[PDB]
Design an enzyme around this catalytic site. Structure first.
Site, PDB file in Angstrom:
ATOM      1  N   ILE A  24       0.850  -1.180   0.000  1.00 44.05           N
ATOM      2  CA  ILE A  24       0.000   0.000   0.000  1.00 44.05           C
ATOM      3  C   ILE A  24       0.899   1.248   0.000  1.00 44.05           C
ATOM      4  O   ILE A  24       1.745   1.331  -0.915  1.00 44.05           O
ATOM      5  CB  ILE A  24      -0.981  -0.005   1.191  1.00 44.05           C
ATOM      6  CG1 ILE A  24      -1.991   1.155   1.085  1.00 44.05           C
ATOM      7  CG2 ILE A  24      -0.234   0.002   2.528  1.00 44.05           C
ATOM      8  CD1 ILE A  24      -3.170   1.061   2.038  1.00 44.05           C
ATOM      9  N   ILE A  25       6.757  -1.189   2.169  1.00 43.70           N
ATOM     10  CA  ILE A  25       5.561  -1.179   3.067  1.00 43.70           C
ATOM     11  C   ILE A  25       4.489  -2.111   2.498  1.00 43.70           C
ATOM     12  O   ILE A  25       4.115  -1.992   1.335  1.00 43.70           O
ATOM     13  CB  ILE A  25       5.015   0.248   3.267  1.00 43.70           C
ATOM     14  CG1 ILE A  25       6.117   1.228   3.680  1.00 43.70           C
ATOM     15  CG2 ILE A  25       3.859   0.248   4.269  1.00 43.70           C
ATOM     16  CD1 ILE A  25       5.650   2.664   3.836  1.00 43.70           C
ATOM     17  N   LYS A  45       6.835  -2.491   7.435  1.00 46.49           N
ATOM     18  CA  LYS A  45       7.833  -1.704   6.735  1.00 46.49           C
ATOM     19  C   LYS A  45       9.121  -2.511   6.677  1.00 46.49           C
ATOM     20  O   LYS A  45       9.516  -3.107   7.675  1.00 46.49           O
ATOM     21  CB  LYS A  45       8.106  -0.381   7.458  1.00 46.49           C
ATOM     22  CG  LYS A  45       6.881   0.492   7.653  1.00 46.49           C
ATOM     23  CD  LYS A  45       7.154   1.832   8.328  1.00 46.49           C
ATOM     24  CE  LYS A  45       8.089   2.714   7.566  1.00 46.49           C
ATOM     25  NZ  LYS A  45       8.048   4.082   8.092  1.00 46.49           N
ATOM     26  N   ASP A 151       9.432  17.631  12.115  1.00 49.42           N
ATOM     27  CA  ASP A 151       8.931  17.651  10.747  1.00 49.42           C
ATOM     28  C   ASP A 151       7.422  17.417  10.709  1.00 49.42           C
ATOM     29  O   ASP A 151       6.941  16.651   9.879  1.00 49.42           O
ATOM     30  CB  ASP A 151       9.661  16.644   9.870  1.00 49.42           C
ATOM     31  CG  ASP A 151       9.569  16.888   8.369  1.00 49.42           C
ATOM     32  OD1 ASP A 151       9.063  17.960   7.962  1.00 49.42           O
ATOM     33  OD2 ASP A 151      10.008  16.001   7.609  1.00 49.42           O
TER      34      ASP A 151
END
EC number: 2.7.11.1
Length: 312
Positions: A24, A25, A45, A151
């Protein structure tokens, strides 16, 4: 290339069994006779084992994102949820004479950036305040567990797959342990780190080439809130020059009224929010509840309350 044969069963280092699904990892779920479907609650992942970011993220998840650890926080602080993804396990996986590290974590729905664009790059004041309250809970959590994100942005905010009113902060590949063993890092560069964040939203601290800290995270959220409300930031025309962007942020920090005049009648809580963050020293612990109270006033001013409705 394919690190997994679809439908194969992998065992993590705690001997817990999982089945791998489509990318969709990859989608993943607990081991069973059934296949991993599209409504899978987990992802796996997988990077090369020498991949630095996955290691850094894995360590964050192991230290601060244990399921019971998170659930305990939720109950004691009396939250509806906490937008920190849960860690379900990890291990090593050989294939084609190469070593890969894998990690099982929560699966999510859409990112906010896709939704933001679908609404012509505007979120309502209601939406922005509700998002921000929950991010403040997330930031408070990770800060108290010795980490800063550095971030925050819409593309790193994912909705609960089964609940569009719950938002989660992802991507700790370049997160920073600012306070190992309770000792705050000094105002200086980290030589094993070269992440400045995302140029448009990053902190003045990051701009000055020092390691991120708590105030930096809150500042990033500030810029996001303005981005989300107005669809713009003052410096968005010169993102290819960090000097310009830093200069602009430094000047607007020094005069927040003119930031409001530029960016907008402006919302009082945003201005007050920015004003409170400005007062924070580098190593200072934020009063997160005060910051939330400030955002709560914004909700009360538009005839609403903290009902936990993102209104997306």
């Amino acid at each position: 290339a394919e690190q997994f044969a679809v439908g194969e069963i992998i065992t993590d280092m705690a001997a817990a069994a999982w089945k791998v699904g489509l990318p969709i990892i990859y989608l993943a779920d607990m081991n069973s006779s059934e296949s991993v479907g599209s409504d899978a609650p987990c992802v796996v992942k997988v990077e090369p084992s020498d991949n630095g970011p996955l290691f850094t993220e894995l360590k964050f998840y192991q230290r601060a994102a244990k399921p019971e650890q998170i659930q305990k926080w939720i109950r004691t602080r009396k939250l509806k949820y906490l937008g920190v993804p849960k860690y379900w396990g990890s291990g090593l996986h050989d294939k084609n004479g190469k070593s890969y590290r894998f990690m099982i974590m929560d699966r999510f729905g859409s990112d906010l950036q896709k939704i933001y664009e679908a609404n012509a790059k505007r979120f309502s004041r209601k939406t922005v305040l509700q998002l921000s309250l929950r991010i403040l809970d997330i930031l408070e959590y990770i800060h108290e567990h010795e980490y800063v994100h550095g971030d925050i942005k819409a593309s790193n905010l994912l909705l609960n797959y089964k609940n569009p009113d719950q938002v989660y902060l992802v991507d700790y590949g370049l997160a920073y342990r600012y306070c190992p063993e309770g000792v705050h890092k000094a105002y200086a560069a980290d030589p094993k780190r070269c992440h400045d964040g995302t140029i448009e939203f990053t902190s003045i601290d990051a701009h000055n080439g020092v390691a991120p800290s708590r105030r930096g995270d809150l500042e990033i959220l500030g810029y996001c809130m303005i981005q989300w409300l107005t669809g713009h930031l003052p410096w968005e025309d010169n993102l290819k020059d960090p000097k310009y962007v830093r200069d602009s942020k430094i000047r607007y920090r020094e005069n927040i009224a003119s930031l409001m005049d530029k960016c907008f009648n402006a919302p009082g809580e945003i201005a007050k929010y920015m004003e409170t963050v400005k007062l924070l020293d580098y190593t200072e612990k934020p009063l997160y509840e005060n910051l939330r109270d400030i955002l709560l006033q914004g909700l009360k001013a538009i005839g609403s309350k903290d009902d936990g409705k993102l209104d997306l």
